Amino acid sequence: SDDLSFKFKNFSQNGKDLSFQGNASVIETGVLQLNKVGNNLPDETGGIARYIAPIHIWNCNTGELASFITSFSFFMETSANPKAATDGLTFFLAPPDSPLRRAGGYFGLFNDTKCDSSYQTVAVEFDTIGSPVNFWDPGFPHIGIDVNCVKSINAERWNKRYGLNNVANVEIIYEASSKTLTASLTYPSDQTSISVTSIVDLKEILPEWVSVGFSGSTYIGRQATHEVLNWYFTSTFINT
């Protein structure tokens, strides 16, 4: 496909256009839940949920690159210590058939801290627990752009909020010509915005076709669930 766009205003439990891995799934309240909390989960648990059809990210014959924009609102819920809750969620591009890996601080995308070009992953993380708990991260909750590694290229301090009472709207735009990836988180209750920009050439990083989706993880003791409220996306090789 050259152009693609799909909007989910809700999420039905009988959906047929989303593949889930780990313990992610749509729930009765029509919410896309990325990770389950409570008992009977491994110490590092989480889930991935991606659009069933692989996106045509770049064309190897024309050399053309596709620009894209995606928006979604998510909220988080925790029972105990919020400031100490792990680990967050992610929006990512990767080979559509990539397995679910290590959860917790690795979000399900990476199996350890070693950076490897073979991941062909580009994720915009919303990390809720950093150093010293998560060594490789800055000393505070934040947002970052992950390129083939759990360690961001660039990041921004995020003062995380929990509860349905604090829904966050995210919007990511990747400008193909300037290779600029910009993601912003905005708490609508008060317009508390934040954004992390970066210049990454997806043509070098990602494969011809990739999946676009989400991932969410937490940790025993510091459990919290991360869930998507809706989603929008639009790809296009043909400029604007």
Decide: is 51 part of the binding site for a copy of itself (CB under 8 A).
yes
Residue 117 DSSP SS3:
helix
What burial letters (b/e) apply to 64-78, b meaning 16+ CB within 10 Å?
ebbbbbbbbbbbbbb
The burial class, CB within 10 Å (0-12 / 13-18 / 19+), for 191 is exposed
**Binding pattern to a copy of itself, positions 81-110, x when CB under 8 A?**
---------------x--------------
Q: Which does 86 bind (CB under 5 to 8 A by kind): a copy of itself, Mn ion, ligand MFU, none?
A: ligand MFU
**Listed residue (197, 191, 108) closest to 155, CA to CA:** 197
> Sign of the CA dihedral 198, 203, 206, 210?
positive
The C-alpha atoms of residue 176 and residue 201 are separated, in whole angstroms, by 8
Name the strand (E) or helix (H) holding 6.
strand 3-8
- Closest separation between CB of residue 130 and Ca ion, Å? 5
Which DSSP category does 52 fall into? S
Q: Quick one: 12 or 81, whose CB is closer to a copy of itself?
A: 12
Q: Which does 53 bind (CB under 5 to 8 A by kind): a copy of itself, Mn ion, Ca ion, none?
A: a copy of itself
Gap between the terminal Cα atoms of the chain: 16
Name the strand (E) or helix (H) holding 202.
helix 202-205
Decide: is 104 part of the binding site for ligand MFU (CB under 6 A).
yes
Q: Which span (56-64, 102-110, 129-137, 176-184) binds a copy of itself, by CB under 8 A?
A: 56-64
- Closest separation between CB of residue 3 and a copy of itself, Å? 4
- Closest separation between CB of residue 85 and Ca ion, Å? 11
Decide: is 240 part of the binding site for a copy of itself (CB under 8 A).
no
Q: Which does 2 bind (CB under 5 to 8 A by kind): Ca ion, a copy of itself, ligand MFU, none?
A: a copy of itself
Chain residues binding a copy of itself by CB under 8 A are: 1-10, 12, 14-17, 51-56, 59, 61, 96, 208-209, 238
Chain residues binding ligand MFU by CB under 6 A are: 44, 86-87, 104-106, 129, 133-134, 219, 222
* Annotated binding-site positions: 125, 127, 134, 137, 142
